[PDB]
Predict the structure of Transcription termination factor Rho.
Amino acid sequence: MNLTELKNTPVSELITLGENMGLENLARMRKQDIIFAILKQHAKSGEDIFGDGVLEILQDGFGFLRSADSSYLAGPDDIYVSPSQIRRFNLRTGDTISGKIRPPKEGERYFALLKVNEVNFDKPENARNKILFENLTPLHANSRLRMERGNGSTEDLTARVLDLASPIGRGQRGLIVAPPKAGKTMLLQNIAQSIAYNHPDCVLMVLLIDERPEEVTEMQRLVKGEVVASTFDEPASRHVQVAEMVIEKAKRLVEHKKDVIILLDSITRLARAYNTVVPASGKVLTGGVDANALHRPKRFFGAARNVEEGGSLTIIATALIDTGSKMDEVIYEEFKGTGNMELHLSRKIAEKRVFPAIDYNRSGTRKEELLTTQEELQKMWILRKIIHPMGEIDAMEFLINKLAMTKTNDDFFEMMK
Amino acid sequence: MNLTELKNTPVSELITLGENMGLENLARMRKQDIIFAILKQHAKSGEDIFGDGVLEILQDGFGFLRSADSSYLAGPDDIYVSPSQIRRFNLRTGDTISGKIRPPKEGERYFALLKVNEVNFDKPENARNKILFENLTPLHANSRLRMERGNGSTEDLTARVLDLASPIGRGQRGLIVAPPKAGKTMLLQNIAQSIAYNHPDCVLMVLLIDERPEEVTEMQRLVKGEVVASTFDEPASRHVQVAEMVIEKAKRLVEHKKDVIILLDSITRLARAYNTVVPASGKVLTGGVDANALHRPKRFFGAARNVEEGGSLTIIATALIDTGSKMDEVIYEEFKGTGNMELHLSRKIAEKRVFPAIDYNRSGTRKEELLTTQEELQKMWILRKIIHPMGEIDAMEFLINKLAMTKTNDDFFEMMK
RNA sequence: AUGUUUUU
Ligand SMILES: Nc1ncnc2c1ncn2[C@@H]1O[C@H](COP(=O)(O)OP(=O)(O)O)[C@@H](O)[C@H]1O
Ligand SMILES: Nc1ncnc2c1ncn2[C@@H]1O[C@H](COP(=O)(O)OP(=O)(O)O)[C@@H](O)[C@H]1O
Ligand code: BEF
Ligand code: BEF
Ligand SMILES: [Mg+2]
Ligand SMILES: [Mg+2]
């Protein structure tokens, strides 16, 4: 008796099971209400019920166990967590809790937690003694997260160009700067697919705030990982809540020496949401940005770091420029002094239908020698010195024509000499 | 005895009928008052009266049935809908209701609804069980909505250029960016005529907010569809109300697997209206735009989506640029990074009296391979690569001179090779 | 109202 197991079951089988259990007509009923009635009827027989979810401690002291399939939205099937157990096990926002639950009695509206069985997918004896995320020693990117497929596919050209322009390692904090209508969607899809193919052990999390739902359901059915999104039909409060829950879960996972990867596509939208939810202080800067509005996105971005004791946190955010709004322009670069990695995309190259439209000149990675060998770094330096004199479109055409001849970049580097 | 039937009748015949029924002199009376008196006299004999309209639920709990011929304006002949029936049939704003009505008794001012016969042009048993619009899975444009006439007319050149620049499919969410005095009116008229000619099965709705009455009555007598407009003589409150009613009706139609097409021509004017009706919060951004003013137009724009279960919602809005106001430059923009189709028009080409004055270079459609075949996409790519080096005016002249030689674009593509 | 917008 698990909550996620009943959530994954279809509607027809749940209706059939409820009709066999002998309850009210479930055809004219919601799936969540059907599951609730089935759990009630199964607990009336004396059997136990189990559930799971991410903890969201409220300001009063209690909390609930949000579900991932609903993008951490307030649902009727949330498991109530008393503050006594929180104080007894030192629980915090983001801790994954899995234990026995019971249906609400007369006068209650949510399931109660009796005994916790597993904390953060581990024993509670290992979670009671742990080092906080704020005390971990940061470090630079040491492990190399190669994005090249290696299967010789035609779509691998984007990953090869990305590796030649800006290699990505564990704990990297980069930025994907690109004007609208440049190809950010396809680039993010390719990055997510390459991460899921090359490094399936890492925890991939794609955050899409204030996006077109069709794109949400497309990304959810395309990438092999977790997708937490919030369409534009929701207020900025839900955006802030989702961002906080995601970053808290990422911190709790990193605290257990896990490799978390966050592919953010709405850093600008997140900053707009934070500027909308912040109370007015009577002081407005140039472009309509509050003085204390960028602090929360600043911390959300800076949360990414590489841990020496174990694990890492990678955050790749895509910033929006040339959107016609001065607020986004002020945000983007305020954040430019940030992202230890900038991958610029050119609109002029995208208009020529030359995919990918990557600005190789302005791209780059700091401390790239820690992720590449000596000969590889020398070859990349020679390639950059050869590409720099040529124009952007000409350099992109040259790179595409030279990478189409071979499958691996090593052969291209060997033929360049 | 139908309301719309009496509304379509002329004034002279209604006056004659009222004089034959033996009532007060109807020559010095309004047509609506004449219809009201005729309905009263006909109901005094014991016969039944029927009406219809779009439901507009008020904040208190009751509602009225607005009429389409009055642009959903508050009229004396609105049918009152009690909240009891709303609670009994789960009615919402936008549901088309058609049932028996009765004249108001002593102390009443509006017609009452006794029994509902048809809901959303369908049986109530099919409307009681339905999936909300917020739960439908979005998708990209799959079905091709070809705009080419095919009759070899001289006006078909605009549709041919539009198809070669940006093909339109079901569920598309585009933008027509053009400075003033460019030819937006003729272009919108041609688009509406091509939609009514090629795809007469789709529900066409043209929304004109804050425009001149002459243009309104011109569009109403030119296109073959529904025209809901609101001239500048009305406050922004009526603009917001009309936009809400139109989008709610569109959502209710899409919920019944219908293909709705909305040709918006005032996205900038709608954003200005929303910025005017929003209460001041003491925080003004660059250009005079409120922080929470663009949220409602953002949702109105993002409502457009393609449904996998059935139906679609297409919204083609025309944004205004270079109007001398910085608010529109932020308002029209901020919207640039939202849609997935931009059809730019050049003022320099319009000054040369070269119609249509379309910027073929900056135009385009994302995921265009889902609406065109392989050979068609290759021919469009070759045409774009040939047109790109030439200047805007030169490319437009070349395209016009090459399309004037033949009737179909297939012959042009075959002759280009 | 200052900042924002004006504004480069
Ligand atoms: N690698 C690519 N190959 C082919 N087309 C692409 C590629 N990247 C982008 N595009 C085209 O650009 C359009 C928009 O790209 P997108 O990633 O949505 O840009 P952004 O996210 O910056 O708005 C897509 O619909 C696609 O047709
Ligand atoms: N396809 C066309 N053919 C001929 N003249 C046109 C065409 N499109 C626009 N025009 C001219 O431009 C004028 C204004 O066009 P309009 O569509 O009103 O531009 P906008 O809507 O951008 O203000 C029209 O009065 C018309 O004379
Ligand atoms: F319009 Be893109 F997604 F920035
Ligand atoms: F003056 Be146009 F209608 F934009
Ligand atoms: Mg995008
Ligand atoms: Mg116009």
Remarks:
- Chain B touches chain A at residues 129, 134, 137-140, 171, 173, 281-287, 289, 291-292, 298-299, 302, 305-306, 329-330, 332-337, 340, 342, 361-362, 364, 366, 381, 384-385, 388 (CB under 8 Å).
- Residues B 158, 178, 180-187, 355-356 surround adenosine-5'-diphosphate (ligand 2) (CB under 6 Å).
